[PDB]
Design a protein around this ligand. Structure first.
Ligand SMILES: N#Cc1cc2c(Oc3ccc(F)cc3OCCn3ccc(=O)[nH]c3=O)cc(F)cn2c1
Lengths: 546, 413
């Protein structure tokens, strides 16, 4: 009773569940009365009369070490009808954002949901009846007086209840820090180990006065602290040991589990790569299809095993020290970064891969990586870090001034660690005086898929190359690549395709299309390249064929 | 509680707003806590329990050197104002866009007096986030009329009219329009007499209990028009210059279908060098000059459709210059302009685009009485991080993020 209840309504225009259950044999009937009577004595449930109430199916089941039974009520139909609640904390705190405390204590509340009472005007909708053998003997009706196990609003109400119970204690003890997570409590403070144990005992007796049990036996947990797949040591943090299975045949389910452990291990283990293995999972069409491996995926997994071979740890946060982030390029559209305050100790690491689109240059990918780290830092530490980026200032200053989009990078200093990021070529802004002008064009038939690409120069030079199994877009890029092959170190190219121009003017560095890659190689080998555009069918100077 | 609360009812068949809370800086979280703690003592906002599943984002702007709290009521507006613009909507005068000077006055303090309908208070719920997901957050709800919600000026509308009635009688040539938190006051007077009459209204509202923090931002709507597309004019012309000219005039044919380019495209037969200077014929100069005056006259059949929404496209031009267009259907630009901020070590791209969006939104408020939806040339996650850094307005327009602006960059300057 001392815990003030939370008013719970049903969804507008709904009514409680009227499902009834007559199965489950007579063996588990008396096995459920053994639980219902002891729950009734503790005030968790109370028998309800034949007032024509609602009902809900209730099942029974044993477990390993069957000396402890288990009552399992299926509140599926009820949860569809109760109101919506404020969502419980979805994301767990990250260890790299936690601060160092001399002592840390863990307490898990037993019978947590059964220790918080339920709203009185709502208990009638949680009724259930234990079936008797149909010898015209009636069923014994019950209903919950506390938060039901598996009910929609149980976690959110218990969190609000627990937070209110901690208020009169955190007001008298502002020196200690109490974290809250589900049915657990993570107390920590810089107090001396003598008075810290007394503060923990005072808190336990406080929570017990509200009906919340706390492990008195021993102290429940020691400094290993296996929590949510983490290792929380008093002066360092790491993930729980990662195990990579070895198989001859790999299925889609196992590759999803493999990239899951790899992404989880990428928090602190620097250099984890998952581009090739995720390229295998690009095929969404399967559940357990045996997907064959690739040579790049086997090598990338072998590199990940070599990194996981040597354990590396991370440290906690010190607000008095600055927050620094450093990025390096891996060379496959992948990037890696480390967030740290000390040279040899990392708070956490991470990677960023550009799986969106097919054409992008390194300066754009570096910016998007800084964006991902900026968001992650505001989440974990609440501030933005200082960036050490392997890029010259004149490089980035030239890119954002030319880029059509709006970008912003905070205070950053140049770290001279190759491979550096730099634009490999810049197109000429004005036409080149004394350079041969190529009038390129490419066409294709979409049914036959047999096109052609060529050019006509101002010097009277013409050429037409046939293409098989191509499209209009491929031929237009093929026609520009053809001009770069048959021209000097300075060339003017004139095309009628808005497509091929937008790909070139983006100035990309790499791509999956080997055609675009060889176009990039030609643009680097040239000295000056000016690419202009004209409408497709205005007959200004373009010569095309159908 | 002067009078019973105005019953607020959402449109039938629609639930309240459940929007996520973007992570905030430790500096900004501490500011919101100080503000909300003071607002809690003054009965404005109150903490709520877990039975309140709705949420509304909350940010911290700089108003000044002190922190100001800004609520993103965009979702609650579309869930209440779309039914409340019909019931208690505020009419938009079409003469405000014709005055010589329009000053904006912040009157958002008036709503803190009026109570909010108790049944509707659960939809104004907002959450102060916690760093690194340590605490579940601080959840408040509003008990008074909240700023940024379009229902507060609609409720306070009758109260605002009574206060402004004596001033309107003394000045029958002054237009006063209210949009959410701002009082747009336009007149044709001299700049000196305008600011004097503005100060009189400030002193008039202040002596009726309406405080306006403006103790030291004026506009001029008679200069807002669809800017004409200018064609480059050089002493000589080359093959490349005529190519950029015909390509631009062909793009303009989608807007002015009375443009011919056959004589400009005949001046170059073909297979010529780009840097080859080519003089223009008489018919080429005739076709050029004919396509110049037809491009310096507004379009035919371009009207504002109140049923359709407004769309604003912005594109980066470099050197601190930004151009924009406001339309409802493609190539039917109702208004175009060019925003330009002073370059130097005091500006960057995101700051310029932010101030440009606020300038465009203010123009759209004066001209049409509603804000447009922005197609922003910026990365989504990037803009959602730093947009509150340079945001001074009290409202938030709708926006989406584009990724493929074509060769239009040169065609709009
Ligand atoms: N199981 C589990 C469990 C315990 C905790 C948790 O405990 C803390 C509470 C307050 C605090 F200020 C620091 C804390 O932990 C930092 C790591 N640490 C550990 C041991 C030690 O001796 N010193 C030390 O610094 C915080 C959290 F977010 C999740 N948790 C899960």
């Amino acid at each position: 009773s001392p815990i003030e209840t939370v008013p719970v309504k049903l969804k507008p225009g709904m009514d409680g569940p009227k499902v009834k259950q007559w199965p489950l044999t007579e063996e588990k009937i008396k096995a459920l009365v053994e639980i219902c009577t002891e729950m009734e004595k503790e005030g968790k449930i109370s028998k309800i009369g034949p007032e024509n109430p609602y009902n809900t199916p209730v099942f029974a089941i044993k477990k390993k070490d069957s000396t402890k039974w288990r009552k399992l009520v299926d509140f599926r139909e009820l949860n569809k009808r109760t109101q919506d609640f404020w969502e419980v904390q979805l994301g767990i705190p990250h260890p790299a954002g936690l601060k160092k405390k001399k002592s840390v204590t863990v307490l898990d509340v037993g019978d947590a949901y059964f220790s918080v009472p339920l709203d009185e005007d709502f208990r009638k909708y949680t009724a259930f009846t234990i079936p008797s053998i149909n010898n015209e003997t009636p069923g014994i009706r019950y209903q919950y007086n506390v938060l039901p196990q598996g009910w929609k609003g149980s976690p959110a109400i218990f969190q609000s209840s627990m937070t209110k119970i901690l208020e009169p204690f955190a007001a008298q003890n502002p020196d200690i820090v109490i974290y809250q997570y589900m049915d657990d409590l993570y107390v920590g403070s810089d107090l001396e180990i003598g008075q810290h144990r007394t503060k923990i005992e005072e808190l336990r007796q406080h929570l017990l006065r509200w009906g919340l049990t706390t492990p008195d036996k021993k102290h429940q947990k020691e400094p290993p602290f296996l929590w949510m797949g983490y290792e929380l040591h008093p002066d360092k943090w790491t993930v729980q040991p990662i195990v990579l299975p070895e198989k001859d045949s790999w299925t889609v389910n196992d590759i999803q589990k493999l990239v899951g452990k790899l992404n989880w291990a990428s928090q602190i283990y620097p250099g984890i790569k998952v581009r090739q293995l995720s390229k295998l999972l690009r095929g969404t069409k399967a559940l357990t299809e045996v997907i064959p491996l690739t040579e790049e995926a086997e090598l990338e997994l072998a590199e990940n095993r070599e990194i996981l071979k040597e354990p590396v740890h991370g440290v906690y946060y010190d607000p008095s020290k600055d927050l620094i982030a450093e990025i390096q390029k891996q060379g496959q559209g992948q990037w890696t970064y480390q967030i740290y305050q000390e040279p040899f100790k990392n708070l956490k690491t991470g990677k960023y891969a550009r799986m969106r689109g097919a054409h992008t240059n390194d300066v754009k990918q570096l910016t998007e990586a800084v964006q991902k780290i900026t968001t992650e830092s505001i989440v974990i530490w609440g501030k933005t870090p200082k960036f050490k980026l392997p890029i010259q200032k004149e490089t980035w200053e030239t890119w954002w001034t030319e880029y059509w989009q709006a970008t912003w990078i905070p205070e950053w200093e140049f770290v001279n660690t190759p491979p550096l990021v730099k634009l490999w070529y810049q197109l000429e802004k004005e036409p080149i005086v004394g350079a041969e002008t190529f009038y390129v064009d490419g066409a294709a038939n979409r049914e036959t898929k047999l096109g052609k690409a060529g050019y006509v120069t101002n010097k009277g030079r013409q050429k037409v190359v046939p293409l098989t199994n191509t499209t209009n877009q491929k031929t237009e890029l093929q026609a520009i690549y053809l001009a770069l092959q048959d021209s000097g170190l300075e060339v003017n190219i004139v095309t009628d395709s808005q497509y091929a121009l937008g790909i070139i003017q983006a100035q990309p560095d790499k791509s999956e299309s080997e055609l675009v890659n060889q176009i990039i190689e030609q643009l680097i080998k040239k000295e000056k390249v000016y690419l202009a555009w004209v409408p497709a069918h205005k007959g200004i100077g373009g010569n095309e064929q159908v | 509680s002067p009078i019973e609360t105005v019953p607020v009812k959402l449109k039938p068949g629609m639930d309240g707003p459940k929007v996520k809370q973007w992570p905030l800086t430790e500096e900004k979280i501490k500011a919101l806590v100080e503000i909300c703690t003071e607002m809690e003592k003054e009965g404005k906002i109150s903490k709520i329990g877990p039975e309140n599943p709705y949420n509304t984002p909350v940010f911290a702007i700089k108003k000044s050197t002190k922190w100001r709290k800004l609520v993103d009521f965009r979702e609650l507006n579309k869930r209440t104002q779309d039914f409340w613009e019909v019931q208690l909507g505020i009419p938009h005068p079409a003469g405000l866009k014709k005055k010589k000077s329009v000053t904006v006055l912040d009157v958002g303090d008036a709503y803190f007096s009026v109570p909010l309908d108790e049944d509707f208070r659960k939809y104004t719920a907002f959450t102060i986030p916690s760093i690194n997901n340590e605490t579940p957050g601080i959840r408040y709800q509003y008990n008074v009329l909240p700023q940024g919600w379009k229902g507060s000026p609609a409720i306070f509308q009758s109260s605002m009219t009574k206060i402004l009635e004596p001033f309107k009688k003394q000045n029958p040539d002054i237009v006063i329009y209210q949009y959410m938190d701002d009082l747009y006051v336009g007149s044709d007077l001299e700049i000196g007499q305008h600011r004097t009459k503005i100060e009189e209204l400030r002193q008039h509202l202040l002596r009726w209990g309406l405080t306006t923090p403006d103790k030291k931002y004026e506009l001029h709507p008679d200069k807002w028009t669809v800017q004409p597309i200018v064609l480059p004019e050089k002493d000589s012309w080359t093959v490349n210059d005529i190519q950029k000219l015909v390509g631009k005039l062909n793009w303009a044919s989608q807007i002015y279908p009375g443009i011919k380019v056959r004589q400009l495209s005949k001046l170059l037969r073909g297979t010529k060098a780009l840097t080859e200077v080519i003089p223009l014929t008489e018919e080429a100069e005739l076709e050029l000059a004919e396509n110049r005056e037809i491009l310096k006259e507004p379009v035919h059949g371009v009207y504002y459709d109140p049923s359709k929404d407004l769309i604003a496209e912005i594109q980066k031009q470099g050197q601190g210059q930004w151009t924009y267009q406001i339309y409802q259907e493609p190539f039917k630009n109702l208004k175009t302009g060019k925003y330009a901020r002073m370059r130097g070590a005091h500006t960057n791209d995101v700051k310029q685009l932010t101030e440009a969006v606020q300038k465009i939104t203010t123009e759209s408020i004066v001209i049409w009485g509603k804000t447009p939806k922005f197609k922003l040339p910026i990365q989504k996650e990037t803009w959602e991080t730093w947009w509150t850094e340079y945001w001074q307005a009290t409202w938030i327009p709708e926006w989406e993020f584009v990724n493929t602006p074509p060769l239009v960059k040169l065609w709009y300057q």
